[PDB]
Amino acid sequence: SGMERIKELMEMVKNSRMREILTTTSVDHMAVIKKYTSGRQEKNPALRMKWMMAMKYPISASSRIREMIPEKDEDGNTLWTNTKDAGSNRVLVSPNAVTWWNRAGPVSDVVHYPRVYKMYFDRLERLTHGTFGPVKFYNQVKVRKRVDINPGHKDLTSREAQEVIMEVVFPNEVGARTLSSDAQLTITKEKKEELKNCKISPIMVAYMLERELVRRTRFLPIAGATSSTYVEVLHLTQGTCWEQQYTPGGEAENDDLDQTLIIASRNIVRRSIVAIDPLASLLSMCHTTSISSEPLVEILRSNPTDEQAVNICKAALGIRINNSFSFGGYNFKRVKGSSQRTEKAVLTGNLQTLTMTIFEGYEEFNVSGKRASAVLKKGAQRLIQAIIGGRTLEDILNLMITLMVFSQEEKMLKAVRGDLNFVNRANQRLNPMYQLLRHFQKDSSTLLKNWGTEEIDPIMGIAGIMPDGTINKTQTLMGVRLSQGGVDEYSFNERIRVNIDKYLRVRNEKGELLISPEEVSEAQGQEKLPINYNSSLMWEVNGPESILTNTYHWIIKNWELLKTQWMTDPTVLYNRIEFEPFQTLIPKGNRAIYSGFTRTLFQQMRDVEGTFDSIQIIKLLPFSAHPPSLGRTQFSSFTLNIRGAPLRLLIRGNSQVFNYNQMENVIIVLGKSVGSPERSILTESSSIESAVLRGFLILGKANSKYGPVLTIGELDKLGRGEKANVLIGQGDTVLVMKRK
């Protein structure tokens, strides 16, 4: 009842050394004296186990084995022996005693293993009922990123889950801190009701709860899906040259499917506009695309996902549009106006150079969901007017932080205090608009006194909010008011009817241009579930790193066919649909200026004989997959958007993107070998070149018998029969003549 431990403490206190230790050691010093060890350290346990298992008794167990396991086997083995001491509570045990217990010990009716290790049985249930597709062989472009190896609880973070575990298992030891969430409280009451009358040790209960509730992450090289059920089978699903198609056993997660529907929508939308019919291609790809081995159009008829590119895929089919987008989890529904996106290089509050994406153009908003409402008048970097509503008085105060992050003026971008790294510890680019969100939730005093005040007229139906938390009726902040009733429901939460056209601009029965394809967010996220665009319009796995390698891999094996199309009737070659998903990597204003340069380079390779570089026709060819312009400008590199970072591709020589390797006789793209082009080096390696400059011929290396040096942009005022020395790029000079 608790009498035995106080009698034992009396017995120990009657010893003098024990009493001095128990009276002089504090609870903090007990952590030090608990790990006190005065013997020699045991090293090398592998070697020690190798030779200790040759002995008869390598195992030390408690003395109760003398009552549970006999001293003699049926075969005559000795199972345990008493130690060299006399009153030791410890015996030396043979592994034959372990085998005796496993074959002839007491059978128990109560086993605890499927409950304590329920996580691993969940894993085995996911594997056993899983399905295997084929194996495809291609160059896997893995990217090292942080993923979840244990998903944890959705309502908890790791520290909140550890505090829930302490409140459940050891409730009288939690100390000063309380549980600061209602989710913590519901999980705590549920786990306390679940774990009543448990004869398991509390530490094993705590570790079982940590396997259930605590989210663990690791940096792993992932090629495909990144949800926690595709990460446990990462050794099975991917390798260096192969992909095993695997669907785990069981029902998928909802928030995982909601995310990967958006990523698959944006790929099909961005692929479609560089087709000659952007609607007929989007319908051809939506009906064949599958997510976690489930078709797309059956997901697009039951999902409440409110996103811009999802709405193109539904308005093409016929599913009704719930027109809104989501920042922070709230429905940010537009009303009126129109904008367009184009990024820029702006400065932030912590003196860091940031590449933000700001929506330039007027947009009227009705932002409302589940706790409040807001009618945000807003244009270009200007929170003009927001009559914000609510239900409780405090829930308006947190949503006040929500709208003022989305505003992005020249006030909130320079009213940031603290340390807000938009990169991570691996120099990985975090998206900026959600980093100001999680920062201003608790640091809000810089967003209330830098925002200032604006004068208003005493009209009824309007309240106010001050910087210092005062509800007011004379003054308030700039562009933010407070209403009472707000805007009612069943107009944001109605899925309205719309119609689509050939170029995917989505307009309703009145004619509101609700979605244009130019308003699609051109980001490449990594999906939680795999996506099989089983179509002849895409490649095997999408991704900007994969579109680069697979396009050049296809030109290299089809080079015997494509070189003949290049030699005669070349405009049939440029119009290939294999070349079309490569154009999603080029920015929009750069497409016609690159094909006009490239085809002008390609025509000078034809009118000048002997200047046939098959390694440079390959490199420039998927930049001609567009109707050209007549803009006679000079380029030394072509930029390519991959994960936000514009990779350059040099017209002359290797790069980090297109590297030809003379040693292996191969073209290396992004570190992936994409095959030997033709192996025609002896016909190649010429002197005169024609596909580097526009209207100019490189004539060998540098020579100063013609005058000074120029650069690539300063060749505009030249004449006939005039040669020069030009910095061509990558630290070298060539003799260059503007021809006839």
């Binding site: 346990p45 592998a46 549970m68 293993y113 049985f121 260096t240 790294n421 510890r425 790069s655």
Partner: protein
């Protein structure tokens, strides 16, 4: 035909077969005998690279200290220690300018961590030099001896349990004119061995109280014990490592915590990242460096190491760095963080074991210790040791040698990283305004430096500028271990980048094998190591299946658990054969019970009990996972909790004995501490789960808990009033004893 493996490098690139250059299947080189020669070598070299500095005698320790700081600038390419304090301050000022708010954020995190760090953080270490014993001890043992000696001498600030009060006691103990410590002495006695009939020496260790002087205590408090690093790959000759005592370790902890907070937020630091995160960071650095370049630019990468990194660093430079990083901070914090460079500027190095001397007439050998080597006549050494002893004699004090320059191996890794990052940070193109600029990444001494320039001579001028700035701050680039090539391939700490990081599987080969804990733990480790190398180190699927088979073969040998139908015979073949014959479902027996191997590629992440659970016999499952398992430890709630683990989770017996050495007198205290910590956990259940905090003694905590537990049990009706009165009177008897 003579067979040459290296000719495979004709066809395969060297990075794609780099695993054939690591001979990591044989044993690594170990050191035999003493480490005194490598200690003397490093003392001689540290004073050789600084020899043109100033010599002074310390007023407190009496040692000869060499000051190379602001010394004469070097005139050749030898390793130099003449770091210029103004250039170090300029580089740290430039690091603060390029990162505004970095030093203040890192100092604030260190200030918050100083106030909440306990003394027992210092028990996180491995083998620590114990100044009370003049010997290495484990870290918790060394801290307990230091706290015991301090509180015996009247330094009771560390009774609060915070680390900073222990550090105040460390600084206050230097004023003590006579320290009184407890030392381990021995008592020898000539007995006759009973099993070989040879007269041996019985060593019996006891405790003894001695009186240290003030200078002897100060020399011991600045003493770094030294030894040779064993099992080091890649080197022909051995080097020495050092361990500091307990008076240095808390200050070194706080300084390295500040420098870790700085290094986390630097994009050019390779610490504290590692693994996939470090490779992601290096690939991001390569891509950003090619992003911050125009097309008329060469780019070259140095694969760099530094010559004698730890010997050419300086604690006075670290003092200037720490004071400039913490500029504008509280002066207690600047004085606390300055203690570790001041203590490393005045350190001595204990020389080691000494040397083994041999007598050919008497046919004997004796170990002459490091403290007796100053009295040995010089004719008794060999030639290299004679030269070492003669040029170290003016540094020798109390068995140690004075070592004022140099830090030691690994003492300040992050602070040295910050210095290298400051030199890397100098090369931004807006700072330099040259025709060149550089960038890169820097670990402890390894760097990858990317120099961009318009011509190859600008690359040379940039390399010269980087090299000479590094020479100004004491950093010496290794000219024989470094090289330069164009950007696209490099090496960083045995990571090989050939347009992307290749796999180096040989590096992981010492982890494939039987680990030696017990049967279940080794099975888990073996499958997990195979799976982790499938994911990260590109272990192919056929080689992973072969690895599973090789692990199961070595496992079945090691625990003598071959299959139940085998023809082999061991000590446990008969009982495993009985268990095999009596079992209906043989496919559910564990491999440690003669069962079949269940593992293939797909189920490598599932433990063996979970994998076989639906195939076990209910008798075998009830015996194997019996909750009355006599091989594991049972926690008392007599009555104990149920077990969860199987019978294969036994513990192997230990052997902490030393040959001919009785040491019961020094092993009493560990048993008494274990008994006190066992009786504490009867009152505080979560002590083994979370470390309990507290400043009250263990006995007061136990009596308070017993009183409130008896009162809550009497309120809840779970005990009677007589039991409550008996518990309260037992507590009053314990308090009557505790008063005396």
């Amino acid at each position: 035909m003579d067979v040459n493996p290296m000719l495979i490098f004709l066809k395969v690139p060297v990075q794609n077969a780099i695993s054939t250059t690591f001979p990591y299947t044989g044993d690594p080189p170990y050191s035999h005998g003493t480490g005194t020669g490598y200690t003397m070598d490093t003392v001689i070299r540290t004073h050789d690279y600084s020899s043109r500095g100033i010599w002074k005698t310390n007023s407190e320790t009496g040692a000869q200290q060499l000051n190379p700081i602001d010394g004469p600038l070097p005139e050749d390419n030898e390793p130099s220690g003449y770091a210029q304090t103004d250039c170090v301050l300029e580089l740290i000022e430039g690091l603060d300018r390029s990162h505004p708010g970095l030093f203040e954020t890192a100092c604030q995190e260190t200030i918050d961590a100083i106030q909440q760090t306990r003394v027992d953080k210092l028990t996180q270490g491995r083998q620590t030099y114990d100044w009370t014993l003049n010997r290495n001890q484990p870290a918790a043992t060394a801290l307990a001896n230091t706290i015991e000696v301090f509180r015996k001498n009247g330094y009771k600030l560390n009774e609060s349990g915070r680390l900073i009060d222990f550090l105040k006691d460390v600084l206050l103990s230097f004023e003590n004119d006579s320290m009184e410590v407890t030392t381990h002495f021995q008592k020898k006695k000539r007995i006759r061995d009973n099993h070989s009939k040879k007269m041996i020496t019985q060593r019996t260790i006891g405790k003894k109280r001695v009186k240290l002087t003030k200078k002897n205590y100060l020399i011991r408090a600045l003493t770094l014990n030294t030894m040779t690093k064993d099992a080091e790959r890649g080197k022909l000759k051995r080097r020495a490592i050092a361990t500091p005592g307990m008076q240095i370790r808390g200050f070194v902890y706080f300084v390295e915590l500040l420098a870790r907070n700085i290094c986390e937020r630097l994009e050019q630091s390779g610490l504290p990242v590692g693994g996939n995160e470090k490779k992601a960071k290096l690939a991001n650095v390569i891509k950003k460096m090619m992003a911050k370049s125009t097309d008329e630019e060469l780019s070259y990468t140095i694969t760099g190491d530094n010559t004698k990194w730890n010997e050419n660093q300086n604690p006075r430079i670290f003092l200037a760095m720490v004071l400039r990083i913490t500029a504008g901070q509280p002066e207690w914090f600047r004085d606390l963080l300055a203690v570790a460079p001041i203590m490393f500027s005045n350190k001595v190095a204990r020389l080691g074991r000494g040397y083994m001397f041999e007598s050919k007439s008497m046919h004997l050998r004796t170990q002459i210790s490091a403290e007796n080597l100053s009295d040995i006549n010089l004719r008794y050494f060999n030639e290299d040791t004679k030269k070492k002893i003669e040029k170290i004699r003016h540094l020798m004090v109390e068995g140690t040698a004075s070592l004022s320059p140099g830090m030691m191996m690994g003492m300040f890794n992050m602070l040295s990283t910050v210095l290298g990052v400051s030199v890397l940070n100098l090369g931004q193109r807006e700072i330099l305004k040259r025709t060149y600029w550089w960038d890169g990444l820097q670990s402890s001494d390894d760097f990858a430096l990317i120099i961009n320039g318009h011509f190859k001579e600008d690359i040379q001028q940039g390399v010269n500028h980087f090299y000479r700035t590094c020479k100004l701050v004491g950093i010496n680039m290794s000219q024989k271990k470094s090289y330069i090539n164009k950007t696209g391939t490099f090496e960083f700490t045995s990571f090989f980048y050939r347009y992307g990081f290749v796999a180096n599987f040989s590096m992981e080969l010492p982890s494939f094998g039987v680990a030696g804990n017990n049967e279940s733990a080794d099975m888990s480790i073996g499958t997990t190591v195979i799976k982790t190398n499938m994911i990260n180190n590109d272990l192919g699927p056929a080689t992973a299946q072969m690895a599973i088979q090789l692990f199961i073969k070595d496992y079945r040998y090691t625990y003598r658990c071959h299959r139940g139908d085998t023809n082999l015979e061991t000590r446990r073949t008969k009982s495993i054969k009985r268990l095999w014959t009596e079992t209906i479902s043989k496919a559910g027996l564990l491999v440690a019970d003669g069962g079949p191997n269940p593992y293939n590629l797909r189920n490598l992440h599932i433990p063996e009990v979970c994998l076989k659970w639906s195939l076990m016999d209910p008798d075998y499952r009830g015996r194997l996972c019996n909750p009355n398992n006599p091989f594991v430890h049972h926690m008392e709630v007599s009555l104990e909790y149920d077990a969860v683990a199987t019978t294969h989770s036994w513990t192997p017996k230990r052997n902490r004995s030393i040959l001919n050495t009785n040491q019961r007198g020094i092993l009493e205290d560990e048993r008494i501490y274990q008994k006190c910590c066992q009786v504490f956990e009867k009152f505080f259940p979560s002590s083994t789960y979370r470390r309990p905090i507290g400043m009250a003694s263990m006995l007061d905590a136990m009596l308070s808990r017993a009183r409130i537990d008896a009162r809550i049990d009497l309120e809840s009706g779970r005990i009677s009033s007589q039991d409550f009165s008996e518990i309260t009177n037992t507590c009053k008897a314990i308090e009557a004893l505790k008063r005396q």
